[PDB]
Design an enzyme around this catalytic site. Structure first.
Site, PDB file in Angstrom:
ATOM      1  N   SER A   1       0.863  -1.187   0.000  1.00  0.00           N
ATOM      2  CA  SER A   1       0.000   0.000   0.000  1.00  0.00           C
ATOM      3  C   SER A   1       0.896   1.233   0.000  1.00  0.00           C
ATOM      4  O   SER A   1       1.632   1.433  -0.982  1.00  0.00           O
ATOM      5  CB  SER A   1      -0.994  -0.106   1.157  1.00  0.00           C
TER       6      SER A   1
ATOM      7  N   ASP B   1     -10.291  -5.508  -4.551  1.00  0.00           N
ATOM      8  CA  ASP B   1      -9.865  -4.513  -3.577  1.00  0.00           C
ATOM      9  C   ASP B   1     -10.625  -3.213  -3.806  1.00  0.00           C
ATOM     10  O   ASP B   1     -10.694  -2.717  -4.935  1.00  0.00           O
ATOM     11  CB  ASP B   1      -8.358  -4.276  -3.678  1.00  0.00           C
TER      12      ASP B   1
ATOM     13  N   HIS C   1      -7.955  -6.281  -0.076  1.00  0.00           N
ATOM     14  CA  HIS C   1      -6.803  -5.439   0.233  1.00  0.00           C
ATOM     15  C   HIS C   1      -5.827  -6.145   1.165  1.00  0.00           C
ATOM     16  O   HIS C   1      -4.607  -6.054   0.983  1.00  0.00           O
ATOM     17  CB  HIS C   1      -7.273  -4.125   0.856  1.00  0.00           C
TER      18      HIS C   1
HETATM   19  S1  AES Z   1      -2.057   1.330   2.668  1.00  0.00           S
HETATM   20  O1  AES Z   1      -1.856   0.108   3.499  1.00  0.00           O
HETATM   21  O2  AES Z   1      -0.841   2.189   2.758  1.00  0.00           O
HETATM   22  C1  AES Z   1      -3.314   2.268   3.579  1.00  0.00           C
HETATM   23  C2  AES Z   1      -3.281   3.652   3.584  1.00  0.00           C
HETATM   24  C3  AES Z   1      -4.243   4.360   4.286  1.00  0.00           C
HETATM   25  C4  AES Z   1      -5.235   3.681   4.978  1.00  0.00           C
HETATM   26  C5  AES Z   1      -6.295   4.460   5.750  1.00  0.00           C
HETATM   27  C6  AES Z   1      -5.957   4.576   7.232  1.00  0.00           C
HETATM   28  N1  AES Z   1      -6.157   3.303   7.902  1.00  0.00           N
HETATM   29  C7  AES Z   1      -5.264   2.297   4.969  1.00  0.00           C
HETATM   30  C8  AES Z   1      -4.303   1.590   4.271  1.00  0.00           C
END
Ligand code: AES
Ligand code: AES
Ligand code: AES
Lengths: 697, 697, 144, 35
Positions: B554, B642, B674
Site C-alpha cells: 500500500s 480490492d 486489500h
Molecule cells: S495502505 O496500506 O498504505 C493504507 C493507507 C491508508 C489507509 C487508511 C488509514 N487506515 C489504509 C491503508
C-alpha cells in the site's frame, strides 16, 4: 390439544444425556493439595435446527488419596462439531482426534497447539475410517510413537468399456457386488488394521490377518511387539451384527513384521471385549457358549500372557446366584475396567428390572454388588482410573445425573461414598413401582417350572379417579426394560396416562433358563404373559377398564398385533412401529435369516432349502392369521429404508385391514431406518402417536 | 530451495495467537481457599485444510485476595465452529452465543444445558447481524432479562414487472442502489438496534434514532431505563470506516419507550469507545479533535451521569510527556477497563517503538506506566475484573505468551508481579535492536524542528561475514512498527537475511507534531527518511551493500516505487503488494477520496470540482513520474476485489515497465481483498516473495 | 455511452430546455477514464492527441481532457436524472456515473440510480433489458 | 465473430477451427501427494 402436547415435548426434550467421560493427570500444588480434572461429553436434541448437538464440559476434583475433599465446575459448555473418535495418551499430555471436514483428518493436540494433522484421504492407502462401536477403535502405543486404528479395505480402480483417453484400471468391474454387515453398517464390507507413525507420517497396513476374517477391537501387545484383535468369521456370507452377540469370532495376535497370526482362544464360539491389565500381565474378555439366541448370559474369562493359561472367572447363572446377581448381560465392558492393583474388575449389568454395578475379584471369583438395596434405579459406569470411578445415575422420574466415587479396598466395597458432580431436578408428578407376576399353572412348561416375570408401573401422583392405561411390551425378544429415564413414558405419565411396561419370560436379567424358555413358543407364551399382567393390574389397581391402549415396536408390534387379534374386546387403540407380520416371508428379505428359524423352533444351517413343514410352522405363528378378527383402530409407522425388518410386512397387514373397511392410518418415512432415530422423524412420530392415543381415548 | 522454505514456513506458522479472554465467578472452598477460572480463545493457521481454526482453553488461578497463590491448566483444547459473538452474564451464570449454522441463531447456555434458542431469520424483523468491531455489539441487561444487539435494517420486498401470480411488493425496485461503508463492509448500509426478551421471545426495534445517523457500540443505561450508543453521520454519503478514526460521530441516549434522543457530547468531532463504571455513575470515552488525519493522538474524556458535567481527563501530548508517555493512539479501549474502586482506567498504547500498559487516575489526571524500562517488548491487555488483569506478551524473537497479574493499590502501580499462565519457547537465532536516527539539517522544516525517528534491526545471531538486507517501510502512513512477534520478518531473519523496519516521521507513538509534519510533504520527506536510515545502517553495521532489497505494501509500495525510481543504483530487488501509483486517478475509484486531498496538502470538501492546480499537484507527487528510470526487477501482487486501492493502479505501472522491456512478474488474485488475508493467498504470496528475493539476491 | 455523454452536456449548457433525462453507462470524466478502460487510445484520439505506447501523463493533455468533460457543468444541472449502471462493465468503468451521482446528490437534485451487479456494457440480458426499459418508460411518463 | 471459425476441407476429410492455447499445469507449494 396439539399446542399443550408440543409445549410438553419441548419442555421434556430439553434434558441432556451423558455419553462419555475421561480423567486427566494428577497435579500436586505447592500447598500440598492434589486435584484432577474430568472431561464429560453430553448430547441434546435441538428442535430449532432439528439436530442432535454434542458439547463438552469440564469438572475438577480435589482429593486426599482415598477421599474426595471437594468437587466443582471449571467453566462453561463448548459445542463441538465433526469429531468421530478421540483418545488421550497414556501419560495425558497428548490427544488424538479424528475429524470429518467432506474429507477425514487425524489431528494431534498438545497444550494450546495442534502439533500435526494428516489428511488420510490424500495418501490413498485405505477407505473411510470405521467409527462405530462394533469394529471401530483408536489406540496409542506404550511408547506414544504410533497410533493404531481400523479402516476400510481399498478397492481396485475400475472404468467403463467406452471411455475416452487423452491423446491399470479394470474395465467393466464398476458394478460388482460387495456384501456389507447389515443394518446400520451400509458400505462396510471388509475392515483392515492401520498403523500410523507420528514422527514420519507413513501409514502401514498390517499383514498376516486370515483372509476369511474381519478384524476389530485391537490394542497394542505388551512391549509393543504386536497387535491383539478380534476376528469375526464372514464365510460363506455375513450375518447381521447389530444387537447380536451370537456371531462366530476369535481372539488373535499378530506381530508387527510380516508373520503368521497366533490363536489365543477357541474358534467355535463368540468372544468379545478384551481389556489389558495396567501391569500388562493378563487379559479379560467375554465369551458366549452358544450361537442360537441373539442375546444371552455370558461368561467372564481370563487369559495369562506369560503362562498361557485360560480360566473361567465368572460362569453361567441358571436362575439366580444369591439375591443380587443373575448373570452378565452387557455386551461391552468399559474402556477402563481394572483396579489399580490389577486384581478386580468393575462393570455394570441388568438385575431383574434395575441396572447395578458389580465388582469381581479375578483371583478368587467372588462378585460383590456396589449398589445393592434401595428402591431402585439405573447406574452406568463410564471410566475408572487409579480407583476413581465416574458414574451416571437415573430413575424413571429423575433425569440423568453425574457422580464420582472412590473404590474401597478389598472386602469393603459395600461402603462406597458418592459425591454429586451434576444433579438434575426431579419430577414429583410421576410415581413408579415394580410388580412381580407368577404365571398360572396352565401356562407353564415342564422343562422350566417356577419362573416369574415383572412389570414397571408409572402413574400420576396425587390423582383425584378412573384413568386410562397404555401397555408396552419390549422388543428383542431378548431384551428388557430397566428403571431408567425414558422420555415417552414420562410424557405419557405427565399428560394423564398410566404406563405399564412388561418384561415377559425370555427377557435379559432373569437367568439363562428364562432366556432358553422362550424360543420355539413365540406367539402363544409371551401373548398370554402380557394378557395376564394386564388383567392382574386392572383387577388390583382398579383402573378404567374401558380405556386401555397398546404400543410397541418390532417384536413389540408383533405382540401388539397378536393381542389385538386374539382378544378383540379388550383394547381400544394400538400403535406399532415397524412390526413383524409374516415370519415365512420375512426370511428372504431380512439380514438375519437365522432369527426366524431360531424363534420358530428349528436349527439354522447354511445351504438350506425351504420345507413344507417348516414353512407351515412359521405361518402358524404369525399374527396375520388373526387379521379378519381385528376390530381396533390402528396407526402404523414405517421406514422405507429399513433392512432389519422389510417395510412390506406392515403393508400386507395394512392392505388386509383396509380390504375390510377398518379405520387404519399409515405413515411412511422415505429415508428413515429401523430405529427412526432422526430428530424430525422421532418428533413427528411421537406427536402423531400421542394425538392418536388422546383422540381415541 | 522451495522444500526448505516450505518446511520453515510450516514450522513458523505452527505457532498460535491469542484473541480474547474472560474471567469467571469467584468460588470459595470448604478449606478456605479461593480460586477462579479463565477462558481464553486462540486462533491458528492450518495448511492441510487451508483455514484459520479457532479453539478455546481454560485455566485456573488460586488467589488469596491480593496475590496469586497458584495457577494451572484445567483440561485440553476444544475447537469451535460457527461462533460470531459471545458474552457472559454479569453474574456469570448464563452465556449468550451467536452462531451461524446458512441461518443465524441466538442461544442461551446455563450449566450443562442450552436453555433457549432463537432463529432470528424466521421472525423476519431485520437482516443479518453485525459481527465486526466497528458497529457490532452484544450486551446483557442489569436485570439479565433482555439482550441488546445491532442488526441490519429491513428492506421492503420487491418484484419484477412480469411475474406470474397464482390463480404488497413494489414492482421494478429490485435493483436499487444501497451504499455500504466501504472496505471489508460489503452489504452493510444502515444498522439498527434490536432488543430481545428472553422470557417471551419478542424482538423489538428501538425508535427515536435520528434518520441521518448509524448507531453502534451500545450498552444499557444505569437502571435499565434506556440505551446509550454512538451515532455516525452518513450524509451526504458514507466514507470509509476501516482504520479511520476521523469520521464525524456523536454520543446519544434514547429511552426504551418511544421518545426523542438526547445528546451527550459535541456534534462536531469524532468520539468512540464508551465504557460504564462498575458503580454505574460515570462514563469514559475517546475524542479526536480534528478530522484531517486518519489516525492521530486522542483525548480521554469523562462524563458524569448525574451532574451532567464533561471534563477532559487526558489531553493531547505535542511531543513527549515525561519519558514514558507520548499520547493515546489505540482506537479501542478494552471491554473491561475500570478498577474495582471506579477511580482508575487501564489501557495499552504505543510508545516510540514498543507497546506499553498505562494506568490513569480519573480524579487527578496522572498517568503511570506499568511496564516501563527493560529492553523492549509488546504488551496487550485483554480484560480486568476485580483488579485481576490478563495480558499477552510478545517480542520479535518470542511467540505470544499469556500472563495474569494483580493491580497494586494507588501510588504503587510500578510493583506489579506477573505470573506466567502460558509460555512459549524462544528462538535464539534472532537478535533485534532499536536505532534512533536524527535527520540532517537540510531535511528539516521550519514548523517542526528537532524531530527524530527510529528503526528496528533484526539480524541472525552468531553470524560468521557479509549478509544481505531487506528494508520495510510501513503503510498508513499514520501507523508504526512495534517490537512484537512478526511472522515474515522472523522467517527472513531465520533464512539468512537482515531485516530493517523503518518508522519514518509521521508515525504513531511519537507525538502529535510528528503526525502533523507529514501531510503535504509525501513523496519527498518519507522517501528521504528511509534513504538516510538505509545509508546510516549500511555505513555503521558494515553489511553487504551489493545486495539490498525492498518490500512494502500500500503506502509502503508507494515508498518502494519512489525509492526504486529516484535511486536506481542502490536496490537489486523489490516486492510490492497493492501499491499506490497515481494519486490523481485514485480519487475517483477509492472509498476514501479525502485521503488524496489531505495527503496532497489540500482541504477536502463535499460537492467539490476538479481543478487544474490540484490535479497537477497530485500528479507531481506520484512515483509514475519516475517510471522511465526504473532498472530494478519487480514482483507485483494484486487483489482484484480490492476497494481501498483499485487494482488498475498497479496495472498502469506494469504496462509502463513492460513497454520498456524490464523484468517484471505479476500475480493477480481474482477473489482476494486489500489485506490478502486468506490462508492460501497469504501462503502463496509469501512463498513467491521469498523465492524472488533469494533468486535475485 | 457516448450519447449519454452528449446528454449530460445538453443538461449542463442548456438547463432550461429539457425536463427529463435517461442515461445508460455514460462517460463523465475523460481524464480518469484513461486508467480504467480497455481502449486507452480512444481518449487521446477524441481529445485531439496521438496515442503512443510507453507514454506518460502530461499537464497539458490532462487539462485538455478535463476541459471537454460534462462534469465541468455539473453545478448548473437542474433536470431530474435516472441512471442505469452495470457493475461488471469493462468498456466504461461504472465509477464514472457514480462521480456524477455524488456531485448531483450533494446539491439536493432529484436523482434515481439503478445498479446491476452482474450486467455488462450492453445490458443485453433479458431481465436486465426489460427492467431498464420499463423503468425508463415509467420515468419518462411520470415526469412528462 | 472476431476469431471464431469452422471450415471444411475441399476433400471433405478434415475440419479446421480455432481454440484456446493450452496452459501448463500448476499446483500449490503445500500439496499432499499419495504415498
Ligand atoms: S495502505 O496500506 O498504505 C493504507 C493507507 C491508508 C489507509 C487508511 C488509514 N487506515 C489504509 C491503508
Ligand atoms: S425388533 O426391535 O423386535 C428386533 C428383533 C430382533 C433383533 C435382533 C437382536 N438384537 C433386533 C430388533
Ligand atoms: S459507447 O457506446 O459510446 C462506445 C464508445 C466507443 C466504443 C469503441 C468503438 N466501437 C464503443 C462504445
Amino acid at each position: 390439544e396439539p399446542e399443550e402436547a408440543a409445549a410438553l415435548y419441548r419442555g421434556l426434550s430439553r434434558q441432556p444425556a451423558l455419553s462419555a467421560a475421561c480423567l486427566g493427570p494428577e497435579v500436586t500444588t505447592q500447598y500440598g493439595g492434589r486435584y484432577r480434572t474430568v472431561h464429560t461429553e453430553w448430547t441434546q436434541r435441538d428442535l430449532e435446527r432439528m439436530e442432535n448437538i454434542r458439547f463438552c464440559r469440564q469438572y475438577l476434583v480435589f482429593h486426599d488419596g482415598d477421599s474426595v475433599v471437594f468437587a466443582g465446575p471449571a467453566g462453561n459448555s463448548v459445542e463441538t462439531r465433526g469429531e468421530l473418535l478421540s483418545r488421550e495418551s497414556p501419560s495425558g499430555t497428548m490427544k488424538a482426534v479424528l475429524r470429518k471436514a467432506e474429507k477425514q483428518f487425524l489431528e494431534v493436540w498438545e497444550k494450546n497447539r495442534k502439533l500435526k494433522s494428516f489428511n488420510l484421504s490424500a495418501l490413498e492407502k485405505h477407505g473411510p475410517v470405521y467409527e462405530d462401536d462394533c469394529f471401530g477403535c483408536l489406540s496409542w502405543s506404550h511408547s506414544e510413537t504410533h497410533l493404531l486404528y481400523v479402516a476400510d479395505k481399498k478397492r481396485p480402480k475400475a472404468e467403463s468399456f467406452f471411455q475416452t483417453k487423452a491423446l491399470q484400471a479394470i474395465k467393466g468391474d464398476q458394478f460388482l457386488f460387495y456384501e456389507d454387515w447389515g443394518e446400520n453398517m451400509v458400505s462396510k464390507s471388509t475392515p483392515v488394521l492401520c498403523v500410523l507413525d507420528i514422527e514420519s507420517g507413513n501409514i502401514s497396513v498390517l499383514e498376516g490377518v486370515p483372509e476369511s476374517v474381519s478384524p476389530g477391537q485391537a490394542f497394542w501387545a505388551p512391549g509393543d511387539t504386536g497387535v491383539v484383535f478380534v476376528g469375526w468369521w464372514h464365510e460363506p456370507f455375513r450375518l447381521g451384527i447389530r444387537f447380536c452377540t451370537n456371531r462366530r469370532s476369535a481372539l488373535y495376535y499378530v506381530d508387527l513384521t510380516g508373520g503368521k497370526c497366533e490363536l489365543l482362544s477357541d474358534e467355535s464360539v463368540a468372544v468379545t471385549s478384551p481389556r489389558l491389565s495396567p501391569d500388562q500381565c493378563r487379559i479379560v474378555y467375554l465369551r458366549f457358549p452358544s450361537l442360537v439366541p441373539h442375546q444371552q448370559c455370558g461368561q467372564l474369562c481370563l487369559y495369562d500372557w506369560y503362562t498361557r493359561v485360560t480360566s473361567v472367572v465368572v460362569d453361567i447363572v441358571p436362575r439366580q446366584l444369591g439375591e443380587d446377581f443373575s448373570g452378565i448381560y452387557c455386551s461391552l465392558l468399559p474402556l477402563g475396567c481394572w483396579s489399580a492393583d490389577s486384581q478386580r474388575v468393575v462393570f455394570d449389568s441388568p438385575q431383574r428390572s434395575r441396572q447395578d454395578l458389580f465388582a469381581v475379584d479375578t483371583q478368587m471369583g467372588s462378585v460383590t454388588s456396589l449398589t445393592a438395596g434401595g428402591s431402585g434405579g439405573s447406574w452406568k459406569l463410564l471410566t475408572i482410573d487409579r480407583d476413581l470411578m465416574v458414574v451416571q445415575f437415573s430413575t424413571p422420574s429423575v433425569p440423568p445425573s453425574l457422580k464420582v466415587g472412590f473404590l474401597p479396598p478389598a472386602g469393603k466395597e459395600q461402603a462406597v461414598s458418592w459425591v454429586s458432580l451434576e444433579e438434575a431436578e426431579p419430577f414429583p408428578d410421576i410415581s413408579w413401582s415394580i410388580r412381580v407376576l407368577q404365571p398360572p399353572p396352565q401356562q407353564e412348561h415342564v422343562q422350566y417350572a417356577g419362573l416369574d416375570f415383572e412389570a414397571i408401573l408409572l402413574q400420576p401422583s396425587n390423582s383425584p379417579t378412573q384413568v386410562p392405561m397404555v401397555v408396552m411390551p419390549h422388543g428383542g425378544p431378548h431384551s428388557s426394560f430397566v428403571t431408567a429415564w425414558m422420555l415417552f413414558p414420562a410424557m405419557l405419565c405427565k399428560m394423564g396416562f398410566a404406563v405399564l411396561l412388561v418384561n415377559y419370560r425370555g427377557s435379559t436379567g432373569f437367568g439363562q433358563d428364562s432366556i432358553l424358555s422362550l424360543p420355539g413358543n413365540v406367539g402363544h407364551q409371551d401373548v398370554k404373559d402380557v394378557q395376564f399382567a394386564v388383567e392382574q393390574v386392572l383387577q388390583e389397581e382398579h383402573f378404567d377398564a374401558g380405556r386401555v391402549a397398546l404400543m410397541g415396536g418390532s417384536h413389540g408390534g408383533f405382540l401388539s398385533c397378536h393381542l389385538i387379534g386374539q382378544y378383540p374386546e379388550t383394547y381400544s387403540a394400538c400403535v406399532v412401529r415397524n412390526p413383524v407380520i409374516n415370519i415365512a416371508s420375512m426370511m428372504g428379505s431380512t439380514d438375519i435369516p437365522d432369527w426366524c428359524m431360531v424363534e420358530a423352533g428349528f436349527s439354522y444351517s447354511s445351504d438350506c432349502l425351504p420345507d413344507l413343514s417348516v414353512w407351515a410352522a412359521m405361518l402358524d405363528k404369525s399374527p396375520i392369521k388373526y387379521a379378519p378378527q381385528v376390530k381396533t383402530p390402528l396407526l402404523l409407522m414405517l421406514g422405507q429404508e429399513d433392512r432389519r425388518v422389510p417395510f412390506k410386512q406392515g403393508m400386507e397387514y395394512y392392505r388386509v385391514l383396509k380390504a375390510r373397511n377398518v379405520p387404519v392410518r399409515l405413515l411412511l418415512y422415505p429415508k428413515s431406518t429401523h430405529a427412526l432415530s432422526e430428530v424430525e422423524v422421532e418428533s413427528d412420530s411421537f406427536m402423531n402417536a400421542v394425538l392418536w392415543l388422546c383422540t381415541h381415548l
